[PDB]
Amino acid sequence: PVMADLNGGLQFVPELKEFTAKLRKELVETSEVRKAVSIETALEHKVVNGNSADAAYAQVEIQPRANIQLDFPELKPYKQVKQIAPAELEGLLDLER
């Protein structure tokens, strides 16, 4: 039997449980502190500038309507449609047949 170890050296970190828990705690407490400061600065802006200087920041969104097209075939300019057919074709076909 072969015991492969693909752990990536994680076995050498002591008390991994509490060390992952620690790291997660520092990311969480840094995210919550910077939220609780951004929400204070927002409130202070809203009290100093009221609802009229913070109303200019609200843009008008356009919402799409359905514009159901009949999907007619696009006609190219005459130079473009003249290039695909052989130059001999003009006046060759009986356009009633």
Task: Report the interface residues with other proteins, using CB under 8 A.
Answer: 1-11, 16-17, 20, 32-33, 36-37, 40-41, 43-44, 47-50, 52
**Which tokens sit at 80?**
């473009």
Instruction: Provide the minimum distance between the beta carbon of 32 and other proteins in the complex, in angstroms, as a whole number.
Output: 7
In the chain, the amino acid numbered 2 is: V
Between 40 and 82, name the residue whose CB sits nearer to other proteins. 40
**Which tokens sit at 6?**
């693909």
Can you say whether residue 29 is alpha, beta or left, with left for phi > 0 and alpha for psi between -120 and 50 degrees?
alpha
Instruction: Provide the minimum distance between the beta carbon of 54 and other proteins in the complex, in angstroms, as a whole number.
Output: 10
**Which tokens sit at 92?**
């060759």
Residue 36 Cα distances to 25, 43, 60, 64, 83, angstroms: 16, 11, 29, 37, 67
Instruction: Provide the minimum distance between the beta carbon of 23 and other proteins in the complex, in angstroms, as a whole number.
Output: 12
Q: How far is CA 45 from the centre of its chain?
A: 29
Instruction: Provide the minimum distance between the beta carbon of 36 and other proteins in the complex, in angstroms, as a whole number.
Output: 5
Between 49 and 82, name the residue whose CB sits nearer to other proteins. 49
Between 4 and 66, name the residue whose CB sits nearer to other proteins. 4
